[PDB]
Amino acid sequence: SPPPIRMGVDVPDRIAGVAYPQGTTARRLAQIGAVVTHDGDTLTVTPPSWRPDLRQPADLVEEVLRLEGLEVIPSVLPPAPAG
């Protein structure tokens, strides 16, 4: 098994800009074969041996977002910086 990865429970929600229902991140990461443990608001995710592409929290975010679907991500224009 690859080394474990610590990631905030709401990190996929913050990156996607979507308040996913509770347990959405943990269920998806378990669906792809990873061991998910809880420690307050921080998850510890050990990806399966056939997923060495999962090395960082960003890799885990891609798993939750692609399984939940990118079509649920809303179109929100960022604020205009004073250019």
**Measured distance CA(53)–CA(59) in Å, rounded:** 7
Reference 3, options 36, 38, 46; nearest CA is 46
| The 3-state secondary structure of 8-62, one letter per residue | ECCHHHHHHCCCCCCCHHHHHHHHCCCEEEEECCEEEEECCCCCCCCCCHHHHHH
Window of 16-24, 44-52, 63-71, 72-80 that interacts with a second copy by CB under 8 A = 72-80
Q: How far is the CB of 2 from Mg ion (least distance, A)?
A: 13
Window of 6-14, 19-27, 31-39, 74-82 that interacts with a second copy by CB under 8 A = 74-82
User: Binds 83, which of a second copy, Mg ion, none (CB < 5 to 8 A, cut-off by type)?
Assistant: a second copy
User: Binds 80, which of Mg ion, a second copy, none (CB < 5 to 8 A, cut-off by type)?
Assistant: a second copy
Q: Does 83 bind a second copy (CB under 8 A)?
A: yes
63 marked as part of a ligand binding site = yes
> From the annotation, which residues make up the binding site?
53, 59, 62-63
